[PDB]
Design a protein around this ligand. Structure first.
Ligand SMILES: [Mg+2]
Ligand SMILES: [Mg+2]
Ligand SMILES: [Mg+2]
Ligand SMILES: [Mg+2]
Ligand SMILES: [Mg+2]
Ligand SMILES: [Mg+2]
Ligand SMILES: [Mg+2]
Ligand SMILES: [Mg+2]
Ligand SMILES: [Mg+2]
Ligand SMILES: [Mg+2]
Ligand SMILES: [Mg+2]
Ligand SMILES: [Mg+2]
Ligand SMILES: [Mg+2]
Ligand SMILES: [Mg+2]
Ligand SMILES: [Mg+2]
Ligand SMILES: [Mg+2]
Ligand SMILES: [Zn+2]
Lengths: 131, 190, 52, 199, 51
RNA sequence: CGAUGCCGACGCUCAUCAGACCCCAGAAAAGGUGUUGGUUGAUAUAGACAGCAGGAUGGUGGCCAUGGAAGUCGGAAUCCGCUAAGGAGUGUGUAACAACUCACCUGCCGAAUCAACUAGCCCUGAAAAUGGAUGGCGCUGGAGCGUCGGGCCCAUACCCG
RNA sequence: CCAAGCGUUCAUAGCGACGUCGCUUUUUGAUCCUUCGAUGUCGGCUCUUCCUAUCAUUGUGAAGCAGAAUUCACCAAGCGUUGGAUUGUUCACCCACUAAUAGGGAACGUGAGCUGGGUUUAGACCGUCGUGAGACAGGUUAGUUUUACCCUACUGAUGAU
């Protein structure tokens, strides 16, 4: 019921982020972002908690050469919260999901942003820690 | 073609007194008074007789459109007589398949609240025209009774309620819910 | 469910109508010409189709 | 000196045609109550006419004209300007011989107003024809002082009513006085009747 | 491009260089969070804890 | 913008894209229960046209063709009796029953009514890019359209000098 | 526009043959009126504006509209109509997001605004053609993008009556 607030977007289209699950994919290459209408010359951009469409550039062959739905769980660009805290992570990471938002893998490596965890309970249950 | 003369007469009941201020018609009866101005029509109004009064409407040198206005005035004047003697009573039935339509009368019958129409959370509030009173019908369930002396005010009041409960973005041949005018009578049957 | 008498009352206002073939205007059941200028008061009327 | 006209019940273009010819002959004209002026045709088709005018604007700089005046007085003024050769000194001199007012401000409120029977709506229109009111039309295209002008026009009418009652009073005395002095003025009353002055 | 060939003029709606800022502006719906009191000398003591 | 500031004449037309003068500067088919005028044909004081009752059946569910159609769907035929009358049937309804309304008829009240065409004006048909042009303002008891009067305006034309 | 048909039934919910009447100038033509003492020739980029023949959104009418989705029509151009791979491309096609991914004009808007990828000088290669010099709406590679301080318009800045 409580809607997420705007956060700074650090991952335009073309960003290659780490894949932080145990699917087999090493990195995720963002080809688009969900919910972006955009305007002329503006690249769609993604932040923690956003579902994006990505391909695997490095990883298991069965996962390569196709488009997956993924969710960003960490970002290197610092975003403000309503308590005034500017948080950023050591790296940009995501996890492959399906359209329903449930993970394709079962484990997550590293922390998961609170912004994404609140939005995706299936990702939240797998998060070892929350930031 | 212009017609030399076209006229019609109206009989006035004994308990009704009609006075003319030019083309303004004032009808006074047991239930009250109604004044209507006919200055937008170029006719000639005349009161004839003293024991059995009559109202005459004349249209000299009228084309087809102007002749059609002669009876229209007579019918309006007759309705005014009907209003001040018997009054007007429109009844409405509320129709619904699943969701009962709850109607609450406020402000001595001048405000109507409609709730749960097709299950909507929105509350519809319809304001009756002056001189028109709405009331729930103690005789029948899911019925309203609108009463007043002016037919147009009463019937406009009922049109407001009927159009308040309109179905949107559905097949209205299937979703028939609404409050509708079911009868056009008189307050005092006589 | 609706009492069949009340259904007829509702149908008088929602179903018993003629429809202009040129401009789709809702018309009284005894209409012989449309009332809209946009179609030139055409007499190409058809009944409002009945819901099944 | 000045020809004061009352715009109530006059059709816009017929009043302008007569007024324009008058100021071109060197006469000063004042038209008051321009909101009381009328136009033939239903209100709606006359509102569409002004909205069509309202759309005329220099696409590259609207501030350079046309200027769409919203007051019923200025609408009438521009209509008289359209019947004058206003791009010549002779026309501009005439255009300066015309004053236009909404309502009746002083000093014309306490002066007699003339009408133009060749532009009166009761004369020139068939009674079954629709017509528009310049004030209502102006109010619905951006005029802002319809409510105030009506407020001040009602004050004027209240004062004019007291003035009329005073004049009727002074006329009832005038008739009585003529009876009291009837004997002394009978001879002079015969001269006037002999020559048609008194009937 | 500051306009098409026709109209053979630069339109008022095309971006041009000039003054930026120092514009009159009216902004609405700025909530008052606090109406603070000024300093007072009371009993020989400066009372200024308005924060 | 010189001249109708004629007590001009008889009609038509309302346009929420009106109309407005050779060339010429924008419109067609097809439509309208807008309005006007015409042509033809009906029917009406033996009381017409609305409005306000009944009737759905007697042979008979006419026989075919039917999985099944009884007046009710396709194809050729398409009669009688009792009568104020009553199609061997216009429309209601299914996969079949089931069901109803018109044709018809008299009861009422009391002057014109119905239909098909045809032609005027108006309207629909009728969408483009800078804002926009009966020349403009504007004009609707016309300053519009058709038929016509007196009068008046002025070319470097005609007349006299 | 007519309406033979399609649509289980049923011409016209939605379509619609045989015919026929139009509109438009974002296609191509046809013509040769203007410009050959020169109006800078494609496309993109950028930027404003306008049209409606409406894809989305607001309000609506109709469906063979139960709901959901969709289709047809009305008032309607206020606000939107995107990111990319291949191509010089306009066009095209595909990926992806989206409420939607509508269509167009402005000297086929816009080169003293750019860029110069293509076309369209001089160098050079290939194929076909030619004895040849050379040619090719056939490929290929390299090939100078000038001036504003004038007037106006526009943007701001003093000021003037
Ligand atoms: Mg771009
Ligand atoms: Mg303003
Ligand atoms: Mg001579
Ligand atoms: Mg068929
Ligand atoms: Mg030539
Ligand atoms: Mg030639
Ligand atoms: Mg030249
Ligand atoms: Mg040039
Ligand atoms: Mg449109
Ligand atoms: Mg639906
Ligand atoms: Mg060009
Ligand atoms: Mg240029
Ligand atoms: Mg250049
Ligand atoms: Mg090149
Ligand atoms: Mg070369
Ligand atoms: Mg050779
Ligand atoms: Zn219609």
């Amino acid at each position: 019921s409580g809607a997420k607030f705007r956060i700074s977007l650090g991952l335009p289209v073309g960003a290659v982020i780490n894949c932080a699950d145990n699917t087999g994919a090493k990195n995720l290459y963002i080809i688009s972002v969900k919910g972006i209408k955009g305007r002329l010359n503006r690249l769609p951009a993604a932040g923690v908690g956003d579902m994006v469409m990505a391909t695997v550039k490095k990883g298991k062959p069965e996962l390569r050469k196709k488009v997956h739905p993924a969710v960003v769980i960490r970002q290197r660009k610092s975003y403000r919260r309503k308590d005034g805290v500017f948080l950023y992570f050591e790296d940009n990471a995501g996890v492959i999901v399906n359209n329903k938002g449930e993970m394709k893998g079962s484990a997550i490596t590293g922390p998961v942003a609170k912004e994404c965890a609140d939005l995706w309970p299936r990702i939240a249950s797998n998060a070892g820690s929350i930031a | 073609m212009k017609t030399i003369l076209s006229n019609q007469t109206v009989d006035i009941p004994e308990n009704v007194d009609i006075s003319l201020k030019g083309r303004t018609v004032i009808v006074k009866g047991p239930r009250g008074t109604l004044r209507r101005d006919f200055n937008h029509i170029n006719v000639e109004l005349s009161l004839l007789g003293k024991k059995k009064k009559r109202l005459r409407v004349d249209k000299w040198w009228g084309n087809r459109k102007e002749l059609a206005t002669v009876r229209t005035i007579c019918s309006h004047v007759q309705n005014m007589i009907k209003g001040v003697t018997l009054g007007f009573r429109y009844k409405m039935r509320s129709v619904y398949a699943h969701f009962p339509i709850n109607v609450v009368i406020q402000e001595n019958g001048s405000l109507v609240e409609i709730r749960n129409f097709l299950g909507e959370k929105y509350i519809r509030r319809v304001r009756m025209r002056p001189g028109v009173a709405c009331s729930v019908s103690q005789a029948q369930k899911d019925e309203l009774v609108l009463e007043g002396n002016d037919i147009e005010l009463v019937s406009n009041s009922a049109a407001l309620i009927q159009q308040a409960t309109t179905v949107k973005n559905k097949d209205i041949r299937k979703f028939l819910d609404g409050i509708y005018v079911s009868e056009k009578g008189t307050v005092q049957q006589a | 469910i609706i009492e069949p008498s009340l259904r007829q009352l509702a149908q008088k206002y929602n179903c018993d109508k003629m429809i202009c073939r040129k401009c789709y205007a809702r018309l009284h059941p005894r209409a012989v010409n449309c009332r809209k200028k946009k179609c030139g008061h055409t007499n190409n009327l058809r009944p409002k189709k009945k819901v099944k | 000196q000045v020809l004061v006209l009352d715009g109530r019940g006059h059709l816009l273009g017929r009043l302008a045609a007569i007024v324009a010819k008058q100021v071109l002959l060197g006469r000063k004209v004042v038209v008051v109550r321009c909101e009381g002026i009328n136009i033939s045709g239903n209100f709606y088709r006359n509102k569409l006419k002004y909205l069509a005018f309202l759309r005329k604007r220099m696409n590259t700089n609207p501030s350079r004209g046309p200027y769409h005046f919203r007051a019923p007085s200025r609408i009438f003024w521009r209509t008289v300007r359209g019947m004058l050769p206003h791009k010549t000194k002779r026309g501009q001199a005439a255009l300066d011989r015309l004053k236009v007012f909404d309502g009746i401000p002083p000093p014309y409120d306490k002066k007699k107003r003339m009408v133009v029977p060749a532009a009166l709506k009761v004369v020139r229109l068939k009674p079954t024809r629709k017509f528009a009111y310049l004030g209502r039309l102006a109010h619905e295209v951006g005029w802002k002082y319809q409510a105030v002008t009506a407020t001040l026009e009602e004050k004027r009418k209240e004062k004019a009513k007291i003035h009329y009652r005073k004049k009727k009073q002074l006329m009832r005395l005038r008739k009585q006085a003529e009876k009291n002095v009837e004997k002394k003025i009978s001879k002079f009353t015969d001269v006037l009747k002999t020559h048609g002055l008194l009937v | 491009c500051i306009g098409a060939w026709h109209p053979a003029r630069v339109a008022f709606s095309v971006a041009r260089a000039g003054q930026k800022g120092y514009h009159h502006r009216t902004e609405i719906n700025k909530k008052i969070y606090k109406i603070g009191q000024g300093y007072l000398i009371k009993d020989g003591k400066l009372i200024k804890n308005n924060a």
